């Protein structure tokens, strides 16, 4: 069992812009575990829309390349959970943000969140943040996460981080 807590009063409107991804966690070190894992993604933007849905934009390390991908997120009664169908996920959660720097958000499958769950820190600017990182650090306190990463603004600016 892994238990979310997502913020209560997100106003998903407030989140629209350029994103990186600054550190990224996961429940099974294989998620994330080399270039080519399956949950490692560099999120470029987040584009709500009117109704309240969410358009994320990634970059992936797919056929020798690091690719472009679009997850459309449909909106829920809890304003911070999302249903998608991408990367064998159906949940985004997003934990936390400030809307003007940084935005903590998980990808899992709902069916067995022990193998599926993907958390990040992204910031709006392509710099390295304290607060972001402790602020993540405090969200995944109670999550069991077995792989963590954190990047520098060398590798925030990089295709697919390097
Ligand atoms: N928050
Ligand atoms: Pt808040």
Not at 22 to 42: C, G, W
Not at 138 to 154: D, E, G, Q, W
Request: a negative charge; one cysteine or more; aromatic letters at 6%.
């Amino acid at each position: 069992l892994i238990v979310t807590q997502t913020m209560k009063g997100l106003d998903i409107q407030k989140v629209a812009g350029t994103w990186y991804s600054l550190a990224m966690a996961a429940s099974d070190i294989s998620l994330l575990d080399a270039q080519s894992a399956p949950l490692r993604v560099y999120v470029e933007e987040l584009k709500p829309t009117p109704e309240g849905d969410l358009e994320i934009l990634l970059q992936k390390w797919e056929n020798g390349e690091c690719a472009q991908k679009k997850i459309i997120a449909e909106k829920t009664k809890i304003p911070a959970v999302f249903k998608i169908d991408a990367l064998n996920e159906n949940k985004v959660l997003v934990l936390d943000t400030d809307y003007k720097k940084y935005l903590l958000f998980c990808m899992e499958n709902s069916a067995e969140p022990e193998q599926s769950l993907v958390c990040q820190c992204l910031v709006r600017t392509p710099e390295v943040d304290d607060e972001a990182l402790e602020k993540f650090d405090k969200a995944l306190k109670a999550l069991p996460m077995h792989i963590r990463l954190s990047f520098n603004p060398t590798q925030l600016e990089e295709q697919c981080h390097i």
